[PDB]
């Protein structure tokens, strides 16, 4: 019931040595809130969860929860391709005060639909707070079928929605039909988020909103009230950025953008690396198009 | 330019021997028009252009044009993976009274962007009427890049638009930005048509509108009037059908649906073949969901 | 049985106007034979089948059959995505003296396995001479399943083999196993042909043999005699040329290579177009590495 | 240079609670060796590395090293999508007595060629023993370009080769040309290993060799001395099992197969799950076909 509109997949700012910059993080979360973001999602993919330790993951969530002071929902990443690790991560996120967890389909080991059911069901039984399934075939190769999604949301009261990063907007409809109008569908793809909403989504767990939280929340508020005229005008401001920040592997591009706005430094953890100067120029053009410079 | 809304990718009704059912076709087009369709597209892929002869292609266009009598636009298929054949087909479509031609990206031979430019430019130079580019990677493999699209509609006044069947809604945005708001965007994919419109589309060259031309015409009008609450309600009625007519190779599904409504028979030309019983049942239930069967 | 070794996917030389150059075609076919090619395949993809008329298709086959004078097998292309058109193309090939036909999986309309069965069975019932199945998902999208091949070669004594252009060498094993050791398997991919013979192939319907008929004949002979040390070394000479003539859409590349050896001019039919200079330099280096100029 | 022939990507036996079954593991390694395997690779993908803890990872390598007693090379898995993690895994592997490490292209985060260079270089600098590159786009999505392979083997003496799981045999030829004939090339795809050796491979880091270590070793020795008649004959015995052990997600298939030979139990850790009966039947059939059951 809480999750709709623009929800930022928070970057995790690092210092010159690659250590977490806590102050930059907290100042970034405050800004996101005062700019009008409708929710935040710490320690996901965009937050460099693959290269964070368990201790860092906990700490970032703790800081994020404390800085937010309940003003907006906190949907923390708790993803792994190991079910027992995902269980431990979701439990930590709950202890650290998260309002829900975002849990990706296991990547690399390519489980089947029964494997997906065992994975998400084990997590669901281990915690009390709600779970958003993060379906992303472009990264995990496998894909959670709608029927599996239905089974999980029907069998567990705390499995309540999806971050649909398929960018295949027809899925929004099938999911609405088979999981219900009550199934909370958030886009996981800025590039198709507008169309996603038209098909039944109610917002986006966003990358671009790291640097444009106001415009993103405006676009999604426009969608929530059925003002698609305004939504299409805003989309047009954002699309070039939406694309540009995925030219090179994320979050190199969204971090450079934040950095251009003075929000953090550009440092990322290997195998994520610095942008080439061509990509930098293209992000600059896109930021200018959006009115952010 | 005035080309907007629901435009049916018309099926070609066959009789029991696989010959053109010319009566059923003319009656179907009339029904299409009285049901409120905003345009029709004869002899495209859904019309089994792969298995039609040159003489059939010509004839069906003629009958479509005579029946339609300029009440709505007729956008005839003139696709081939041979530039010189595509040119000849387009010329035939124009001579037969077509208002525009629908031209697929060459398939099988996998040309590059240069090849695509040469293909479409040779066609545009050969006729006066408008051309809509039919980008469909899922069938042609290759994909006309947005920069090729923009270049073609810059260099030729009569290349005006796209039937975008990529089903990747972000392309509507990039096309709008780089080809202009003038550039006519129509979805070629009923399953993502709603969202396509949200990103900038002005309608859809539809398969499902063969059997639901009123609902589809209404869905797109809803989008055209920017009433997206109504559009979504109508989308929910149509979506199961939209999917179900693509479980097996098209247009077996759509023709079966048309059959159940008495619009035509179910015969298709090989390698298109009859549905399995399981697909018939899914299409039946989808048609009840849409309220097309009562 | 005589379908083994190197079989050239013949180019169709055109004059400056794009008309068939009959005299260049006949001379090229003679040269192919004298250079030791084990067979020829007119009017397929490499011969620009998509952009030839029915009359041109018949004529090229006619000239090829006449020139070859039974010295090697002629496997004529008779492909289409219309069954009725493929049937007529096969009947013309047979009437023109072809020893077999090469029939591709329908492209563009994406038939299912039942449609594929209907399509090939129709052709098999219309002609007496053998049919080789041309499986090439990279151009047709659909793939003929091994079960379907197996079914077709059980039910029709004149469906005898495959031009396997999948580039997935494991398929040669499954095909060998389920269609039989008697099923004639030939590679449709020069780049993987050596390996495909290892798994059970007995040759290749080749693009590279257009310009390297002797070396390709030598390599597949090595394979046929089970001399793989020699085959690997001949491959080392051919691989750059094998890759290079696919950098741009074929047959622009193979035609340019033939032009460089004085065998024909470079004209192709739209939408196939002239090569860029980068590509022509790369082909030149490949031809030089092979010892062909 | 001693890295040739059939090298088993070792499964990791678990007891009924999913804990490491250590006696099963040690007995299995012993069996692999006496059956004539040419090397072992513990705590890789087939050994369920994604679901092992660092402490388990360390223990399985220690056991494997002690059990092998230098009779054959031990190529320990040290894969991660985090560079700092892979670095630490590679160090424990070395400190545990591995002769080499097997390091997969980072998965999920989809790095570019420069990120791959940074990832692999950092590992090379942190250890002394050799590194084999595990290229597997079917799981990591990204591919390590051949130029990138070349750059790493040029700049680092201890990066010496590839476990090539692309299944695209032309890569063997390209890698042979550009990285050197000294570059060590092992197939990571039992289904294409035969042809991979023909194009220049010198072995295979194998899943099927878990249950057929002798037959697999025989096939690769046949290739190593260029007896491809024999190679093919042994390939025809194994191919059905090579496919079958991947119908469902690995190592569910190969462990069932191993349980059918009394080598371990069928327990795997989620999200890996037990086989359905349809796959079990197919695996039985292919075991009978290879002569491993009568």
UniProtKB/Swiss-Prot annotation, chains B, D:
Localization, UniProt: Cytoplasm
Pathway(s) annotated for this protein in UniProt: Amino-acid biosynthesis; L-lysine biosynthesis via DAP pathway; (S)-tetrahydrodipicolinate from L-aspartate: step 3/4
InterPro entries: Aldolase_TIM, DapA, DapA-like, Schiff_base-form_aldolases_AS
Keyword terms of this UniProt record: Amino-acid biosynthesis, Cytoplasm, Diaminopimelate biosynthesis, Lyase, Lysine biosynthesis, Schiff base
Disulfide-linked positions: none
SUPFAM superfamilies documented for this protein: Aldolase
Annotated GO biological process: diaminopimelate biosynthetic process; lysine biosynthetic process via diaminopimelate
Residues annotated to bind pyruvate: 46, 205
EC number assigned by the record: 4.3.3.7
CDD domains xrefs: DHDPS
UniProt keyword Cytoplasm, yes or no: yes
Reaction it catalyzes: L-aspartate 4-semialdehyde + pyruvate = (2S,4S)-4-hydroxy-2,3,4,5-tetrahydrodipicolinate + H2O + H(+)
Keyword Lyase in record: yes
Superkingdom: Bacteria
Enzymatic class: lyase
Function summary: Catalyzes the condensation of (S)-aspartate-beta-semialdehyde [(S)-ASA] and pyruvate to 4-hydroxy-tetrahydrodipicolinate (HTPA).
Assembly information from the UniProt record: Homotetramer; dimer of dimers.
Record-stated family: Belongs to the DapA family.
Name this polypeptide is given: 4-hydroxy-tetrahydrodipicolinate synthase
Organism: Bartonella henselae (strain ATCC 49882 / DSM 28221 / CCUG 30454 / Houston 1) (Rochalimaea henselae)
């Amino acid at each position: 019931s809480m999750l709709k509109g623009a929800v930022t997949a928070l970057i995790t700012p690092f210092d010159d040595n690659g250590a977490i910059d806590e102050k930059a993080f907290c100042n970034f979360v405050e800004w996101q809130i005062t700019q009008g973001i409708n929710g935040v999602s710490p320690v996901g993919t965009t937050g460099e969860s693959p290269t964070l330790t368990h201790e860092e993951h906990k700490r970032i969530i703790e800081l994020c929860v404390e800085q937010v002071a309940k003003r907006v929902p906190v949907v923390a990443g708790a993803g792994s391709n190991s079910t027992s690790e995902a269980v431990e991560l979701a439990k930590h996120a709950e202890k650290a005060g998260a309002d829900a967890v975002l849990v990706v389909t296991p990547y690399y080991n390519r489980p089947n639909q029964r494997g997906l059911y065992t994975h998400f069901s084990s997590i669901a039984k281990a915690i009390s707070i709600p779970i958003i399934i993060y379906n992303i075939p472009s990264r995990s190769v496998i894909d959670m079928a709608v029927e599996t999604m239905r089974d999980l949301c029907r069998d567990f009261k705390n499995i309540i929605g999806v971050k649909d990063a398929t960018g295949k907007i027809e899925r929004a409809s099938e999911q609405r039909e088979k999981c219900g109008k009550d199934f909370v569908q958030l886009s996981g793809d800025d590039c198709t988020a507008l169309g996603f909403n038209a098909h039944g989504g109610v917002g986006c767990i966003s990358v671009s909103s790291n640097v444009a939280p106001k415009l993103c929340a405006q676009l999604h508020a426009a969608c929530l009230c059925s003002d698609y005229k305004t939504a299409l005008k805003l989309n047009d401001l954002l699309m070039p950025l939406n694309r540009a920040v995925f030219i090179e592997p994320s979050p190199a591009g969204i971090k450079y953008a934040a950095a251009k706005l003075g929000l953090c430094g550009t440092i990322v953890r290997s195998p994520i690396v610095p942008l080439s100067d061509t990509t930098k120029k293209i992000i600059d053009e896109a930021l200018y198009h959006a009115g952010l410079l």
